[PDB]
């Protein structure tokens, strides 16, 4: 039949359908999303995170430390 | 994401009702801010995800839409209201562009 | 399950007014509304239909350009955003939820809001 | 809660100016900041985005490779450093401040500077 | 409501040659389009069309096996691609949209594009 | 892989229980799970579903809201809280996986598991 | 995010089962935790990540849900398992907030 | 492994007063920590947070500016110091525990003091 | 989804037109990329989503089609542009798979 | 911008082999990519993608569970650990970036490396 | 995080080639090193941060890897060589955990 | 560049054994050790942690309030000090030099010592 | 922590305008330093901590940046300013280490 | 404030050769000082440090056991006993103070020397 109204039929199902492919779409955008929340996280861990560099930190202040025990 | 809005200068008087209309080239989904910039400061926001107001916004402003098409009301217009309104779209994988912007004046 | 509009009242003509629709007690992100009018005198009249994304939208033949319909899925709410009214809009504007149907071709409105009255006047 | 620029004047094309921008009133470590170009007979038009660490940068793509955007936690203060100048930048740069959102899709710029003036010109 | 054809030009017979045609100031993921030819001494001549989303096509005996309809519902376009060309395919090509009809048996050609002139010669 | 359930039991007409179900093998983030009740002297029937995220769920006519399904991609579980438990729902509960489908419309349920039994009496 | 628990009363004899859910206002993921608070104390950590055990707690309490559904049981009440059970919400960017919390009494 | 708060007591609008919450038994410049009120007729309420260092801190929108929370690891002892009382702010005030975790995300509060009354009437 | 190729190698002269058929098994839209690796390199882009072009490819070539249709046109072949040139497409929920390939000759 | 592979040679079959892949002149932590093999008298073929973060991965049917595909963004290197090589394994394998797209179904690869040659015989 | 390693056991001649395989239970990012120890002695630093090498060892040993799969590859195996090898991870906020270690054998 | 403990020997259960590890060759002043733990038919186990000045320290689950780690700056010496043994606690004990790292997430352990074996028995 | 020093030699004029650019290897957050050759003398320092001024320098020099990128901008080009910069980090792990200098010479 | 350096000279390779420098117009029993080397051709490579108590010093790696720094509070003089010289030490070598600073982080090199010719040949 080639006469057939090719239009959308707008009186259609405009409902969820609910047999969607729910699986993880394996081909997605796998990059950065520029767009994202670039602030603090404030439930970040706030412990002490016990896996740090416990070396001598060769950069530190040589100096004379002037506030230093001016006592016996 | 091309963004523009209409109409570029919208005469009204203290007291009228006023309505800017921002049409995005793209699906912006509900992402979308609205700022005012009166001469010679800098913009101040007072819609955010095109539905909220931000804090210290008079309940004046009101703004709503999805997609492409959104619509920034003010219920009534004060003197302290007439300045040059902006759109800003920020989708998920897009980056922040600007509307022209349109200029409210007295009548 | 409570389908309640809002943003109604007596505007000029020429002036634009939006209106609202919020939804609760349902998922609204699976549904397609609609907004039908009630114009005292005669019967009911569909105006616009929103299909559930976004993605497609239909008008009256005699609201094409003038009226636009779109939802927030995060915020549960519909606009029906209405541009250049008349005297002729004069009416109740109702929400409709078409009911979930097992075919491809849709089901009647199955909840409808409580209306919002807009009327149009000099 | 006040954000400042500095550091704007008038050189030549292909020469390079720095900014700066100060900010007081609030903790300025915990928030991602942008710059926003403003050309006359022009809308806003956006610039560069420091991540609230410097650990990520995305720029316009007409300035990428001569414009640099980095932070310093430490004294409260953002800076431009604009490389290769020509006569298009001509422009007030303002400073934005990312809104806080309980989400992971950013936010609008809520706190805006006053802008500073640069002019290329010969 | 627009629609402009483009692509048009000279080719030696046996070469390809494709169609372009874009759709403007009207929804086009809601139209199912024709292509119809017009030779100089001749009437119209129906040749493909295309099913509102390339589900279905149908095309004139005469150029079964060598054309090829498809469109691209995210640009608005349409591509008619001519394998083989002839010296008897010599005409203008138009674009032609299905206006709405409230039945299932379609109804005339609604929108016409200017067309563009294809030639075959040695 | 494997697909192993938990939480069964005997519990009393109205009250509440919780099942379990612990995927091992194969990427358990990236499949839409559903639970399938096996009532003796008749044939299997459809629960719930779990959209890979959460985001989705649909529930069977009969247990909508004393029914709640929900994932937790980090353990590689499944959950069905059941509530408001009748005499009707004595049977052994299944998890089924969708199979990849290259396509919008999903697929069978491949991996099933052991099942659970569930028996609800006074 | 607000965080609401129900039933708010919850009578249990010793040896029941008692089930107390907890329902949040927007996704949470897996981050919630349920707390203990007898009459004039502070609060016990009972569940955290909505599924573990904190150590030295018994085994009669478990925890599941993932999303805005979620729901605390105990297999078998105990005499001195009578006390307010709160709910508590860390997400990625949001802050700590509590519910309302369920008091089981005696039947 | 203990903690108790102490400094709690009466005072009239407007005045100022300072808690204090001296922790033992346990690495206390090894853990962040958190203020966390209980008024009668409402649920516990989340107050402020220090980080482990006095680096980053962040308090309820309620009580930004009027409370100022400060930690003294020397001594294993926090300080939450309030300005400018209202009559809302009649609470029990509780020191709260991060607990360990083995990710970037922070945990739930294990170890609560037994809390200190703070009442604010004329 | 197995794309082919036709003609597997065709030869052409300079400033001659040339077109590449890419046929689809099953619809894919309009998601499809054209690569072009001349002979002990690496493959560059030349068109992407089937019609838009690669910055830096001259406006030359050109691609169109939708569907299981795709081809690929050369406007005035250049003496560089004698390569192969390979066929791919990633629909939503298919995995990326690459034609065949045709080698474009000098006559 | 730059994208140079190393790790190629012969190996025996069921020998294990790891492949490396370098990037420069762009920030590599961005970027989701691949790894393409092309046997000689056979198209390409793809084998695996790393998403952005290490977090998600796919590989071809006819590889999974011999190669491991892993990325360490610190220093900007790829590695496709191939284990159990067999005589079919003897390919050229190159590296892709998958190119930015403003929306959430990817795009193609637009640097490609100059591929390493691996052979698998006795 | 629980460690374990892949084959326990592992036969190889003079100058063969060498795969031991480290999976880890959880992501360690890229935190990770492989140790020798010879029967009687203390075990010796080969390789740092799952790929760099250690200052003295060898140009033969090297590794590769991140998340939860690590290998150590050996190019030529020498009669030196024959000794367990074990795999420790220090995660961000996680402690020291160690394998079990896979002993390499004469032939 | 040397490392030697000492101490060992054999206790019976319930009694106290200290250890010790001279350094040699290097400034043991300025890295932090750990103790592990070599039970024969398992892996190394980690121990105890010295944070280069005695300040910070931490230690397995296991042995938490009964093994107490203190280092002498003075004369290059590490202590580790158990109290209440178990037959549990019978293996090789070494010490381990922490590597010195451009960053703050530490490094693996270089230098390891001969070991000292603890036996516990009745 | 490699430094390099870009462009490696710059012409000038008098009342000019100079900018030397640093970069650096690895993150050296806001620890760095410029200073100033002239030929048969000692070096004196410039700038501390990337931002600051040395007492007793003129106010003519400035410099900018942080974590990988730095520069040293001179307003105004004097004639006892031709000499060669260099750029010095210290962070804090690392150890002091210096970019190869460039020269500024009269045009 | 004059830092004046001497000892230098010309040597054979494998012999020893000590530097001083001495310091004057400041306290220098409060400073840290470098020794800094510059061969023509290439840049400043930093060599010693000493702590202004010669409790901790640190060498480059190329010149560690084979240079000494040493200072002596009471004649305000550094030493730099070098041991074992090869082609490559050949260079001028700078004192360096290290600059006052208000935090742990140390500071830049204020004070520097006039330098002093060391040059070793056969």
């Known amino acids: 039949d080639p006469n057939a109204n090719p239009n959308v039929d707008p009186n259609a199902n405009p409902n969820a359908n609910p047999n969607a492919n729910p699986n993880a779409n394996p081909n997605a955008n796998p990059n950065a999303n520029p767009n994202a929340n670039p602030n603090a996280n404030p439930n970040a861990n706030p412990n002490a995170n016990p896996n740090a560099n416990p070396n001598a930190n060769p950069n530190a202040n040589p100096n004379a430390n002037p506030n230093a025990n001016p006592n016996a | 994401i091309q963004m523009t809005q209409s109409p570029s200068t919208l005469s009204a008087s203290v007291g009228d009702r006023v309505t800017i209309t921002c049409?995005?080239?793209?699906?912006?989904?509900?992402?979308?801010?609205?700022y005012q910039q009166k001469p010679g400061q800098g913009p101040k926001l007072?819609?955010?995800?095109?539905?909220?107001?931000?804090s210290g916004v008079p309940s004046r402003f009101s703004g709503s839409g999805s997609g492409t098409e959104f619509t920034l009301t003010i219920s009534s217009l004060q003197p302290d209201d007439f300045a040059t309104?902006?759109?800003?779209?920020?989708?998920?994988?897009?980056?922040?562009?600007?509307?022209?912007g349109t200029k409210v004046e007295i009548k | 399950v409570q389908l309640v509009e809002s943003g109604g009242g007596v505007v000029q003509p020429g002036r634009s007014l939006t209106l609202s629709c919020?939804?609760?007690?349902?998922?609204?992100?699976?549904?397609?509304?609609?907004?039908v009018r009630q114009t005292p005198g005669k019967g009911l009249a569909w105006?616009?239909?929103?299909?559930?994304?976004?993605?497609?939208?239909?008008?009256?033949d005699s609201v094409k350009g003038r009226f636009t319909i779109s939802r927030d899925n995060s915020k549960n709410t519909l606009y029906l955003q209405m541009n250049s009214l008349r005297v002729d809009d004069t009416a109740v504007?109702?929400?409709?939820?078409?009911?979930?149907?097992?075919?491809?071709?849709?089901?009647?409105?199955?909840?409808?809001?409580?209306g919002t009255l807009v009327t149009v006047s000099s | 809660v006040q954000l400042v620029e500095s550091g704007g004047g008038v050189v030549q094309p292909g020469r390079s100016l720095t900014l700066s921008c100060?900010?007081?009133?609030?903790?300025?470590?915990?928030?991602?900041?942008?710059?926003v170009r403003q050309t006359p007979g022009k809308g806003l038009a956006w610039?560069?985005?420091?991540?609230?660490?410097?650990?990520?940068?995305?720029?316009?793509d007409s300035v990428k490779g001569r414009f640099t955007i980095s932070r310093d936690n430490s004294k409260n203060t953002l800076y431009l450093q604009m490389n290769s100048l020509r006569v298009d930048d001509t422009a007030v740069?303002?400073?934005?401040?990312?809104?806080?959102?309980?989400?992971?899709?950013?936010?609008?710029?809520?706190?805006?500077?006053?802008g500073t003036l640069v002019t290329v010109s010969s | 409501v627009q629609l402009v054809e483009s692509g048009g030009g000279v080719v030696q017979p046996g070469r390809s040659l494709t169609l372009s045609c874009?759709?403007?100031?009207?929804?086009?993921?809601?139209?199912?389009?024709?292509?119809v030819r017009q030779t100089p001494g001749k009437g119209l001549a129906w040749?493909?069309?295309?099913?509102?989303?390339?589900?279905?096509?149908?095309?004139?005996d005469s150029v079964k096996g060598r054309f090829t309809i498809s469109r691209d519902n995210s640009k608005n376009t349409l591509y008619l691609q001519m394998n083989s060309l002839r010296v008897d395919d010599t005409a203008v090509?138009?674009?032609?949209?299905?206006?709405?009809?409230?039945?299932?048996?379609?109804?005339?050609?609604?929108?016409?594009?200017?067309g563009t002139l294809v030639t075959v010669s040695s | 892989v494997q697909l192993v359930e938990s939480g069964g039991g005997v519990v009393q007409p109205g009250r509440s229980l919780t099942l379990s179900c612990?995927?091992?093998?194969?990427?358990?983030?990236?499949?839409?799970?559903?639970?399938v009740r096996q009532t003796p002297g008749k044939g299997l029937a459809w629960?719930?579903?779990?959209?890979?995220?959460?985001?989705?769920?649909?529930?069977?006519d009969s247990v909508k809201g004393r029914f709640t399904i929900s994932r937790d991609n980090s353990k590689n579980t499944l959950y069905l809280q059941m509530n408001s438990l009748r005499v009707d729902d004595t049977a052994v509960?299944?998890?089924?996986?969708?199979?990849?489908?290259?396509?919008?419309?999903?697929?069978?349920?491949?991996?099933?598991?052991?099942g659970t039994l569930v028996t609800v009496s006074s | 995010i607000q965080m609401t628990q129900s039933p708010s009363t919850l009578s249990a004899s010793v040896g029941d089962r008692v089930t107390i859910t907890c329902?949040?206002?927007?996704?949470?993921?897996?981050?919630?935790?349920?707390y203990q608070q007898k009459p004039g104390q502070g609060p016990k950590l009972?569940?955290?990540?909505?599924?573990?055990?904190?150590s030295g707690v018994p085994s009669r309490f478990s925890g599941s849900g993932s999303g805005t559904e979620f729901t605390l049981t105990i297999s078998s009440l105990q005499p001195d398992d009578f006390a307010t059970?709160?709910?508590?919400?860390?997400?990625?960017?949001?802050?700590?907030?509590?519910?309302?919390g369920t008091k089981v009494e005696i039947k | 492994v203990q903690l108790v708060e102490s400094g709690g007591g009466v005072v009239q609008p407007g005045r100022s007063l300072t808690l204090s919450c001296?922790?033992?038994?346990?690495?206390?410049?090894?853990?962040?920590?958190?203020?966390v009120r209980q008024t009668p007729g409402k649920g516990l309420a989340w107050?402020?947070?220090?980080?482990?260092?006095?680096?980053?801190?962040?308090?309820?929108d309620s009580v930004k500016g009027r409370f100022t929370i400060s930690r003294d690891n020397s001594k294993n002892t926090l300080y939450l110091q309030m300005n400018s009382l209202r009559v809302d702010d009649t609470a029990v005030?509780?020191?709260?525990?991060?607990?360990?975790?083995?990710?970037?995300?922070?945990?739930?509060?294990?170890?609560?003091?037994?809390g200190t009354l703070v009442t604010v009437s004329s | 989804i197995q794309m082919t190729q036709s003609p597997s190698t065709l030869s052409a002269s300079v400033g001659d037109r040339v077109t590449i058929t890419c046929?689809?098994?099953?619809?894919?839209?309009?998601?499809?990329?054209?690569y072009q690796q001349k002979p002990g390199q690496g493959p560059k882009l030349?068109?992407?989503?089937?019609?838009?072009?690669?910055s830096g490819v001259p406006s030359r070539f050109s691609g169109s089609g939708s569907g299981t249709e795709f081809t690929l046109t050369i406007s005035s072949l250049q003496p560089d542009d004698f390569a192969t040139?390979?066929?791919?497409?990633?629909?939503?929920?298919?995995?990326?798979?690459?034609?065949?390939g045709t080698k474009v000759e000098i006559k | 911008v730059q994208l140079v592979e190393s790790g190629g040679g012969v190996v025996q079959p069921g020998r294990s082999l790891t492949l490396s892949c370098?990037?420069?002149?762009?920030?590599?932590?961005?970027?989701?990519?691949?790894?393409v093999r092309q046997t000689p008298g056979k198209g390409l073929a793809w084998?695996?993608?790393?998403?952005?973060?290490?977090?998600?991965?796919?590989?071809?049917d006819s590889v999974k569970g011999r190669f491991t595909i892993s990325r360490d963004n610190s220093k900007n290197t790829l590695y496709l650990q191939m284990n159990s090589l067999r005589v079919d394994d003897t390919a050229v394998?190159?590296?892709?970036?998958?190119?930015?797209?403003?929306?959430?179904?990817?795009?193609?690869?637009?640097?490609?490396?100059?591929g390493t040659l691996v052979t698998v015989s006795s | 995080i629980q460690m374990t390693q892949s084959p326990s056991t592992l036969s190889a001649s003079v100058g063969d080639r060498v795969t031991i395989t480290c999976?880890?239970?959880?992501?360690?990012?890229?935190?990770?090193?492989?140790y020798q120890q010879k029967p009687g002695q203390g075990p010796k630093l080969?390789?740092?941060?799952?790929?760099?090498?250690?200052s003295g060892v060898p140009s033969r040993f090297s590794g590769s890897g991140s998340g939860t799969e690590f290998t150590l590859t050996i190019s030529s195996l020498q009669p030196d060589d024959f000794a367990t090898?074990?795999?420790?991870?220090?995660?961000?906020?996680?402690?020291?955990?160690?394998?079990?270690g896979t002993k390499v054998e004469i032939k | 560049v040397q490392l030697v403990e000492s101490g060992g020997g054999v206790v019976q259960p319930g009694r106290s054994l200290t250890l010790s590890c001279?350094?040699?060759?290097?400034?043991?002043?300025?890295?932090?050790?750990?103790?592990v733990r070599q039970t024969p038919g398992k892996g190394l186990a980690w121990?105890?942690?010295?944070?280069?000045?005695?300040?910070?320290?931490?230690?397995?689950d296991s042995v938490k309030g009964r093994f107490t780690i203190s280092r002498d700056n003075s004369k290059n010496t590490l202590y580790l000090q158990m109290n209440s043994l178990r037959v549990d606690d019978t293996a090789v004990?070494?010490?381990?030099?922490?590597?010195?790292?451009?960053?703050?997430?530490?490094?693996?352990?270089?230098?390891?010592?001969?070991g000292t074996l603890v036996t516990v028995s009745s | 922590i490699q430094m390099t020093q870009s462009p490696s030699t710059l012409s000038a004029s008098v009342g000019d305008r100079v900018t030397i650019t640093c970069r650096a290897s690895?993150?050296?957050?806001?620890?760095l330093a410029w200073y100033q050759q002239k030929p048969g003398q000692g070096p004196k320092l410039l700038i501390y901590?990337?931002?600051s001024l040395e007492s007793g320098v003129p106010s003519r020099f400035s410099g900018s940046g942080s974590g990988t990128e730095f520069t040293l901008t001179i307003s105004s080009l004097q004639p006892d300013d031709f000499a060669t910069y260099y750029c010095?980090?210290?962070?804090?792990?690392?150890?002091?280490?210096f970019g190869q200098g460039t020269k500024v010479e009269i045009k | 404030v004059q830092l004046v350096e001497s000892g230098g000279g010309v040597v054979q390779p494998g012999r020893s050769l000590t530097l001083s420098c001495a310091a004057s117009?400041?306290?220098?029993?409060?400073?840290?000082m470098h020794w800094v080397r510059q061969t023509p051709g290439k840049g400043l490579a930093w060599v010693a440090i000493?702590?202004?108590?010669?409790?901790?010093?640190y060498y480059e790696d190329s010149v560690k056991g084979r240079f000494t720094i040493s200072r002596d509070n009471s004649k305000n003089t550094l030493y730099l006993q070098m041991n074992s010289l090869r082609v490559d030490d050949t260079a001028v070598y700078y004192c360096?103070?290290?600059?006052?600073?208000?935090?742990?982080?140390?500071?830049?090199?204020?004070?520097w020397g006039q330098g002093t010719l060391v040059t070793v040949s056969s």
């Open positions: 360096a103070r290290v600059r006052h600073s208000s935090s742990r982080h140390g500071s830049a090199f204020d004070l």
């Open positions: 117009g400041f306290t220098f029993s409060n400073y840290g």
């Open positions: 000493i702590w202004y108590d010669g409790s901790k010093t």
């Open positions: 690895q993150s050296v957050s806001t620890w």
């Open positions: 901590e990337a931002s």
């Open positions: 010095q980090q210290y962070n804090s792990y690392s150890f002091w280490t």
